[PDB]
Amino acid sequence: SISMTTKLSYGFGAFGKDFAIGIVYMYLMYYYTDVVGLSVGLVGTLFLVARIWDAINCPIMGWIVNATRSRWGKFKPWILIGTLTNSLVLFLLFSAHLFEGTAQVVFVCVTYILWGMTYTIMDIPFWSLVPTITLDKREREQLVPFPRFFASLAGFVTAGITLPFVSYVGGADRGFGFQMFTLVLIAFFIASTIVTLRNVHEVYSSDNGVTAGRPHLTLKTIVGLIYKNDQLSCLLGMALAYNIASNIINGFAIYYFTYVIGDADLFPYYLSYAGAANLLTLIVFPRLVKMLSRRILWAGASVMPVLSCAGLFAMALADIHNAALIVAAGIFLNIGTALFWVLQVIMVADTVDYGEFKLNIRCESIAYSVQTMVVKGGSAFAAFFIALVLGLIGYTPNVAQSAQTLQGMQFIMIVLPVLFFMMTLVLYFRYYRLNGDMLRKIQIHLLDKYRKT
Ligand SMILES: O=[N+]([O-])c1ccc(O[C@H]2O[C@H](CO)[C@H](O)[C@H](O)[C@H]2O)cc1
């Protein structure tokens, strides 16, 4: 039994954790372009460089978390530090409207990077608590839905309430409203950190005496344990492919809603229905993973978005008008993404257990470093592939193109995510082994091996 209290406290921790970044991810473009007034090229270059640099930084944070011998634990201290420092840096991030000229181009450039690193400090260790809470298949299956559901809910309520709050509190001074809302986020986020730190207790931590973890390891060694843990490498590839495809699809949606108005008030309906789908499929995930195989659910996680892509491909070939097609594609995609995230967290935990099984080392921090690194690098790589595709199609001037050229660009933008999803499902079914009796073997081997000295 995982104490219902620990489940709920981890859920609220995840809520506060993703409620502090959803605003950034979603409206930092709007803030920096519509409020601060910075060139879109500057913002894009900064975002891409920062994602690459944060992805490079992630394994560094994993090494840091692994080598930290502390009282609270090897995770909670960095969780607290990252939470507080990232709260401060988020407030500073959205306080950019105050400065002007180079002074703010530096400010914006200095805060943003600091916002990305700081979050890493708390992001890697937080999820590293999943493997230490339990080692059982079904207990993980019923543990992770709580945090994933709460994170998704944070994202959607952010989308719903952030603009109303800014308009009501600040009005003309939209930047003041943004930073006041940041304060709301900080309150929820710090309270969530306190809750998770107090009520979540580590059982199978690498800082316990019976575990096989070695604190005094090098950065070369740790990053090599990604390659040695073939299952973690397979997870890296799969998650990178899934993230690249999901980022391409989300960019398509951003263009087809922001630039192409489509129909008025289609985006609110789409967002509401898609959030319902996401949160519901997260709520029923234990029942589904009992009824259907975990493998079936991963296959579905990749396939359902592919069905969305195919449907809206058909819409591209025909008239791009059906709102039902759009909202149904969103529903399918959100079901898939929820399944993916739940299964991915469980799979990172399974990979740390398999690392102890094979290499005789327990490193949670590195597996979740791979998770976050892949989140950043998927966006970066999706940008790279999109730029390659657009340059190949002849959009590299970005001045004016044939309508047929634009439609073919849409077609390719649709097919590419499908290729990446096929990559992830193919790689999962060809190389991944931690799903069945192997999971039980690793669990029993670890429990039996957990005998002092
Ligand atoms: O498609 N998006 O815009 C998008 C949504 C959520 C997100 O956050 C996830 O990746 C983070 C990595 O820093 C944290 O692991 C966090 O816990 C995850 O929920 C990242 C991007």
UniProtKB/Swiss-Prot annotation:
Binding of Na(+) and melibiose is cooperative, the binding affinity for one substrate is increased by the presence of the other. With binding of one substrate (either Na(+) or melibiose), MelB favors open conformations (likely outward facing), whereas the cooperative binding of both substrates induces cavity closure. Thus, cooperative binding is the key that regulates the alternating-access process and ensures the obligatory cotransport as the core mechanism for symport. Melibiose uptake is inhibited by valinomycin. An alpha-D-galactoside binds at K17, D18, D123, W127, R148. Changing Y119C: Loss of transporter activity. The keyword Transport applies. Residues 30-40, 97-103, 167-176, 255-265, 318-322, 394-407 are periplasmic. PROSITE patterns: NA_GALACTOSIDE_SYMP (PS00872). Residues 1-6, 66-75, 129-142, 200-231, 289-295, 349-365 are cytoplasmic. Its main location: membrane. Changing D123C: Alters cation selectivity. Loss of transporter activity. GO terms for cellular component: plasma membrane. The chain crosses the membrane at residues 7-29, 41-65, 76-96, 104-128, 143-166, 177-199, 232-254, 266-288, 296-317, 323-348, 366-393, 408-430. GO terms for molecular function: symporter activity. It is a multi-pass membrane protein. Keywords: Cell inner membrane, Cell membrane, Membrane, Sugar transport, Symport, Transmembrane, Transmembrane helix, Transport. Changing W127C: Loss of transporter activity. CDD domains: MFS_MelB_like. NCBIfam families: gph, PRK10429.1. PANTHER family: MAJOR FACILITATOR SUPERFAMILY DOMAIN-CONTAINING PROTEIN, MELIBIOSE PERMEASE. Mediates the transport of melibiose and other galactosides by a symport mechanism. Can use sodium, lithium and protons as coupling cations, with a preference for sodium and lithium. The use of Na(+) as coupling ion for sugar transport is based not on ion selectivity but on competitive binding under physiological conditions, because of a much higher Na(+) concentration under physiological conditions. This is Melibiose permease. It comes from Salmonella typhimurium (strain LT2 / SGSC1412 / ATCC 700720). The gene is melB.
